[PDB]
Amino acid sequence: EEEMKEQLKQMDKMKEDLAKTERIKKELEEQNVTLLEQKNDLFGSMKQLEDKVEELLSKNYHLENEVARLKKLVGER
Amino acid sequence: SIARQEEEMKEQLKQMDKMKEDLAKTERIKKELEEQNVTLLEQKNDLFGSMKQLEDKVEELLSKNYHLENEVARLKKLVGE
């Protein structure tokens, strides 16, 4: 009579434990998606900065050569 | 009702095992997710750090560019370019 209890009771605790663990799992999943998005956004920004760096290093070097050329023409130093 | 009780306890135990099995699977996925989130968080902070270093580099490159363009304009004005 009171034996089916101990098993039924245990089953209830397990049903609860499973529901809880699943909530944590769903929570971790949401965090995972949020982190992946934040990374992709960061990668994109880094790409734009890297391109900008390449663009400026190239323009500056050319400008430095031009400065050198224009200077010899005017007789500067 | 006894044969009925036992038959129910057997089924009950079968459901209990299926429950244990679903819990153990959820736990494996949980740990895998925890580890992935730790890795993602470390990479995020690293990217952030690198982004700040890149911005500082651009900031300086922009100042050199500004000065160079001023110099070239000053010179081209004298030559006639």
Curated annotation (Swiss-Prot), chain B:
How would you summarize the oligomeric state and partners of this protein?
Muscle myosin is a hexameric protein that consists of 2 heavy chain subunits (MHC), 2 alkali light chain subunits (MLC) and 2 regulatory light chain subunits (MLC-2).
Q: Which family does it belong to?
A: Belongs to the TRAFAC class myosin-kinesin ATPase superfamily. Myosin family.
Query: Which classification does the entry list for the species?
Result: Eukaryota, Metazoa, Spiralia, Lophotrochozoa, Mollusca
Function in brief: Muscle contraction.
Compartmental location: Cytoplasm, Myofibril
Protein name per UniProt: Myosin heavy chain, striated muscle
The range of the complete sequence contained here reads: 838 to 885 of 1938
